Automatic annotation (TrEMBL), chain A:
<keyword id="KW-0808">Transferase</keyword>
<dbReference type="Pfam" id="PF01636">
    <property type="entry name" value="APH"/>
</dbReference>
<feature type="binding site">
    <location>
        <position position="27"/>
    </location>
    <ligand>
        <name>ATP 1</name>
    </ligand>
</feature>
<keyword id="KW-0342">GTP-binding</keyword>
<protein>
    <submittedName>
        <fullName>Viomycin kinase</fullName>
        <ecNumber>2.7.1.103</ecNumber>
    </submittedName>
</protein>
<feature type="binding site">
    <location>
        <position position="30"/>
    </location>
    <ligand>
        <name>GTP</name>
    </ligand>
</feature>
<dbReference type="InterPro" id="IPR011009">
    <property type="entry name" value="Kinase-like_dom_sf"/>
</dbReference>
<keyword id="KW-0067">ATP-binding</keyword>
<dbReference type="InterPro" id="IPR002575">
    <property type="entry name" value="Aminoglycoside_PTrfase"/>
</dbReference>
<feature type="domain" description="Aminoglycoside phosphotransferase">
    <location>
        <begin position="37"/>
        <end position="235"/>
    </location>
</feature>
<feature type="binding site">
    <location>
        <position position="29"/>
    </location>
    <ligand>
        <name>GTP</name>
    </ligand>
</feature>
<feature type="binding site">
    <location>
        <position position="28"/>
    </location>
    <ligand>
        <name>GTP</name>
    </ligand>
</feature>
<feature type="binding site">
    <location>
        <position position="92"/>
    </location>
    <ligand>
        <name>ATP 2</name>
    </ligand>
</feature>
<feature type="binding site">
    <location>
        <position position="25"/>
    </location>
    <ligand>
        <name>ATP 1</name>
    </ligand>
</feature>
<feature type="binding site">
    <location>
        <position position="30"/>
    </location>
    <ligand>
        <name>ATP 2</name>
    </ligand>
</feature>
<keyword id="KW-0418">Kinase</keyword>
<feature type="binding site">
    <location>
        <position position="94"/>
    </location>
    <ligand>
        <name>GTP</name>
    </ligand>
</feature>
Amino acid sequence: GILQANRVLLSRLLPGVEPEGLTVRHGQFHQVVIASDRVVCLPRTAAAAARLPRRAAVMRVLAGLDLGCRTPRPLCEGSAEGAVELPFLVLSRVPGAPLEADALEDSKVAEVVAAQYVTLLSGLASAGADEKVRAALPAPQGRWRQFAADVRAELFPLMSDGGCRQAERELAALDSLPDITEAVVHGNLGAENVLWVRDDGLPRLSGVIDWDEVSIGDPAEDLAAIGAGYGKDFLDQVLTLGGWSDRRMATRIATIRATFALQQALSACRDGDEEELADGLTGYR
Amino acid sequence: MGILQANRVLLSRLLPGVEPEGLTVRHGQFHQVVIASDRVVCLPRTAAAAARLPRRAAVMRVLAGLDLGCRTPRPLCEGPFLVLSRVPGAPLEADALEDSKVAEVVAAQYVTLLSGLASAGADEKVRAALPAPQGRWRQFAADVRAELFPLMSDGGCRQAERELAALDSLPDITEAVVHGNLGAENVLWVRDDGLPRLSGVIDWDEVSIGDPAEDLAAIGAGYGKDFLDQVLTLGGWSDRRMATRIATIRATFALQQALSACRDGDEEELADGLTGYR
């Protein structure tokens, strides 16, 4: 038990809470323990521990952006960012729940939901043109070519020959992608990481969670995630309202969206999440 | 007509599909605030407040990026209006501190918030964006003599002058971000999931670069000196010279209330604030 292993530390961070009653999501680097109003990241390795000082900074930068919504706020002191290593990192919990695709069948909901996606993405785009933001966030080069290699190395062994051939087409298209480093890119903006309130009216975007893969990147990565989850008609509505329906943007989205399930499977592989892996490899084995 | 109907176009955009008559509105400090489930809409009463509202959004954006150990109201939208996130939780009842396990834990979380506020004193966005007025206590001393002494007994006037003299002798410190109104009501907690956890702080209307003793005095007013002593000892603020600045600011709280209520046309607060001075 990740909760049992870490019993003493949690009793200090969450005094008077039974750790058995808490929930856990798995990350690549850290395990996130989920309490009622806040989340505790626990590093899995020393290298993960050495990453948390930069995480605190990243999350503080995000907390100051104009996204039209909330983000998980670092509850540490600022000085934590100067550390070599943190043994944990506490963040505020964003309220709300995922929006199921069915709710987009109502036309006026779809419009209001798309509008709020545009505000978020517009804010991320413009923040990616800020030099202080760009200096605080990772901005790797050749991420597509290297993602392809990682899929072949880590996922192909789990696939069928037919799955390997489907994936090869999808991954080869990547090499032709311009390597764009223009926007703040969430990098895993599936519906599960986007939280809404539906208590007093039409859906209102409350916030966005799971920023582990955030970078300076190509906004087409986030728009592909949306299109993977909600399909072409809703994606087109977001592109129109945002001013992103050009053929160039739309081609990068198409290319990236064809890999989005492999992205989820690679993440599930690395964080040990078996059902998430089985789901992501549907049609490849 | 009323505020909801009058502003209904705007609220239909900001709160789509939300029946306006189901909302609650609070009278505020040059600000009408429409409360929705997860956010509030700030509308300026006065044309002066409409002019100053872009600046308030800016301050709230800066506070949203500070490391205070808790939530603050985040600007979600601006236009004239300002939409802020609502902070979850509720004030802590002074009675909760009878439990000494609760008292230590609440005290420690106050230390984090005050430390964060102190540290942010040196931040560039902070010192740029937040008001940092000079002569605060001399200007208030003149305001009191002008507006309140005419309402006071002569013995009251003696007492106030003794408290206003003490206040003049204090150094004009602009080191920390100061909430400026850090009473029990404005600090929100998560209860009934174990021991109390600080969720966030609201009502930043009077926020400035100033002297943290003001915030410590407010904590003292709300919860008493035993709880405040616990905070000062944990935070390493238990020296002589801090204790004097607190006690001196603390002594002016009824006068501050009287002066506010005297201006705002609130006769209930005025009489209560003037209690020992007439």
